Amino acid sequence: SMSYTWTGALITPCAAEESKLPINPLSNSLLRHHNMVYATTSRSASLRQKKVTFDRLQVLDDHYRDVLKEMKAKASTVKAKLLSIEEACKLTPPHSAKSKFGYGAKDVRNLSSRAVNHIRSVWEDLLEDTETPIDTTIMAKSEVFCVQRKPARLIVFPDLGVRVCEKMALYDVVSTLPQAVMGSSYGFQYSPKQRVEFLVNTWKSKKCPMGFSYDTRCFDSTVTESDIRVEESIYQCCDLAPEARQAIRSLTERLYIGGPLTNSKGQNCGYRRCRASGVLTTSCGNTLTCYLKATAACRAAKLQDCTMLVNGDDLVVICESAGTQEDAAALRAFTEAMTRYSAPPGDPPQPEYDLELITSCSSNVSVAHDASGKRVYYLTRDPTTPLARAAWETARHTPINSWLGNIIMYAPTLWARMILMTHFFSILLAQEQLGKALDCQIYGACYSIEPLDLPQIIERLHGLSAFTLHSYSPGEINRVASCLRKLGVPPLRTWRHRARSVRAKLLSQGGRAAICGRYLFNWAVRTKLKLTPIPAASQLDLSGWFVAGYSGGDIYHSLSRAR
Ligand SMILES: Nc1cc(Cn2c(C(=O)O)c(-c3ccc[nH]c3=O)c3cc(C(F)(F)F)ccc32)ccn1
Structure with missing residues (x-):
């Protein structure tokens, strides 16, 4: 299916957008070539829309099914807790986007009666309604870069009331399940000193190491409805409160797998059938999906003694070398398997024989x-x-x-x-x-x-x-x-x-x-x-x-x- 379909309505800004670095004395003390610095705006959103919109062809095999069962066996050890409304409200950033329903992040954090009443009604609706697609807003992200220009990235997110509910059902799952499933491969469990320790120890643990980073092109767009339901099948192995099980089921069908896109003007913009960048499960889901596809791809490629380090869509693999020609061929086979799994590369991966030559998480x-x-x-x-x-x-x-x-x-x-x-x-x-x-x-x-x-x-x-x-x-x-x-x-x-x-x-x-x-x-x-x-x-x-x-x-x- 197409990652996105569009109606032709534009991705609109909500206020004025700055794209040029101001000429200011304090910033100029740091960096004088101000014209080289820019911020992305909704003006480049159509370029991004073209890049992120494509048909996915996904073919699964026995290696993929085997890895998935192994991941689910590890997920089956987890017991996840439902967060109370108060715990979920306290996790809301003070400047989180206000709800369209008459309350904002300050109201959520203060447990105002309007915010709490609305969050309770959204929660009950997740428990009762398993089907109605949940609305999302699509916006161009404002990010700063140095020239040599990137088009704006797009962010897709549901209303504030829904985001509080996602925390209630899933904050404990997304916080505990990834390490339970992926063990030492889960990148987010490490401080920078622990991450460098893990890389150096992993590199040194191989008799003859080879490593490579694997860059998936537009990862969120490559995530299929099957990948999102597979990700839900892993969450469902947790011991869960019945309301949490239903909320996860409802959130998966109504939000995570896809849904309608609305711009900042309230106009129907299109429809998404891939990962939303602005939901609670984006990081966990991407990490699990990337790990599953790469683990299975390592097996298809016959890469030996593979150790992965995964953070969302960022992947680094350290394995036992079989010689430069064998490694070169195995890496092409890994890329071919990742492509079949709907994770094609942005830049083809390169075998590296020096740890300092690998770039992972930039x-x-x-x-x-x-x-x-x-x-x-x-x-x-x-x-x-x-x-x-x-x-x-x-x-x-x-x-x-x-x-x-x-x-x-x-x-x-x-x-x-x-x-x-x-x-x-x-x-x-x-x-x-x-x-x-x-x-x-x-x-x-x-x-x-x-x-x-x-x-x-x-x-x-x-x-x-x-x-x-x-x-x-x-x-x-x-x-x-x-x-x-x-x-x-x-x-x-x-x-x-x-x-x-x-x-x-x-x-x-x-x-x-x-x-x-x-x-x-x-x-x-x-x-x-x-x-x-x-x-x-x-x-x-x-x-x-x-x-x-x-x-x-x-x-x-x-x-x-x-x-
Ligand atoms: N580009 C990426 C990065 C990650 C994960 N990640 C982040 C992140 O933004 O999540 C930071 C990170 C850097 C600066 C401020 N706050 C942060 O969190 C970071 C720093 C290091 C280290 F090298 F410093 F160790 C290693 C990994 C890191 C995942 C996927 N793509």
């Missing part, structure tokens, strides 16, 4: 040295998109601060330490906003974090070595330096000067600011301060941080204030 393993000169593996990535987005976020107040998420996840990197920490600490200190909580996203969930808590967060996620790395690889240094020239970012010598300045100011303030000056900026001075474990680090409650993926799932993970 990131690669690199090596630096700690204070003792000991090799430390860590994950890095090309800093182009992070810097372009940090420039945008400096010029415009944005709901999600990718710069903050990037400092947290890429804390050991040369570019996060020298540029992002320096730039934002300098601005926030000048604004007396170091203690102001900002929103960022980790594995798709929203967190409210104060920049002053960064040292202890970084220590937990990466270890104290995140504050001592030096002797970065020439390849990593060249990539950063070349990115700075391309974007017109001041050179690393300028960042060192600026860091010494903000470090001095931070130390002069004492308290949490001085801890930031000591730990975050020790790289900027020859006279190193002694770095010991931060007491606050062991006290941090990072439960929920690296458990599961929630992209598009409308999840907020910071504490709810009492009432």
Whole structure:
């Protein structure tokens, strides 16, 4: 069937859309080639519509059926809980899109009578009605990139009342079931330090390793109605409350498999028969589907001792090499099986014989040295998109601060330490906003974090070595330096000067600011301060941080204030 059908009504914006990076003094201190930075808008939605619209031909075989039964046997160990309305309301982001039924996210979080009454009526309707397609809104996503232009991605999501109900029926399932089924292959259970440990240990565990990343073209569009019902067959192996079983059945038929698309103007836009990007099950569903297809494809290809690491549609496979020619042929056979399963590649996969050459989750393993000169593996990535987005976020107040998420996840990197920490600490200190909580996203969930808590967060996620790395690889240094020239970012010598300045100011303030000056900026001075474990680090409650993926799932993970 066609992934989408369209009526001809346009994908419309709800307000004015900015596509150009503003010319602002603060963003210009970071990045001077402003014309290279752009934001996607609904103006390019028709280009995206053409790309995502195609017929799927799916052919399943015994390898696929065998893997599925093995996955279901593991899912059969899970007992999932129904969340109460209050628990589901507390998981709603404060700025989540308001309902069309007269209430918004603040009303949901406050358990207002109107929000609660409407959520209760939506829940009862899921229990009673197994068939009526649930309406969804389609919007073009506003995302920032550097030139060389991408068309806007499309987001499809149901009303606020439905999203609260999805959490009630499925939040516990999507949070616990993926690790139960996929074990060590489930990527979202790892902090960045654990992910690098898993990759390095997996690579080193092979007698002669070969690895490859597999990029599916327009993954959500390749997901079939059969794939979504197969995904439901896995959820149904859980021990579930009867209302949760019915809600999952109803949500699968009325929402997950497909449904009508409405634009921001309320006009009927078309019909979807593939994965919706904005539902609670998107991450879990994509991860399970990708794992199932790849596991089965590995068997069809006769790839030996395969270890997968999956996060949504992002897949990396590490296996036992059979020689370059045999691997080359087995990888073509893997791609052929993935294509039969309706997961064709975007770029054909390439066999890799060096772990640092593999790019997975846009990131690669690199090596630096700690204070003792000991090799430390860590994950890095090309800093182009992070810097372009940090420039945008400096010029415009944005709901999600990718710069903050990037400092947290890429804390050991040369570019996060020298540029992002320096730039934002300098601005926030000048604004007396170091203690102001900002929103960022980790594995798709929203967190409210104060920049002053960064040292202890970084220590937990990466270890104290995140504050001592030096002797970065020439390849990593060249990539950063070349990115700075391309974007017109001041050179690393300028960042060192600026860091010494903000470090001095931070130390002069004492308290949490001085801890930031000591730990975050020790790289900027020859006279190193002694770095010991931060007491606050062991006290941090990072439960929920690296458990599961929630992209598009409308999840907020910071504490709810009492009432
Ligand atoms: N492109 C992708 C990424 C993922 C998963 N993912 C995300 C994500 O946005 O979900 C981040 C991630 C990066 C920055 C801020 N917040 C985050 O969550 C991240 C960072 C690392 C690491 F390299 F830093 F370890 C590894 C995997 C990561 C899944 C599918 N496609």
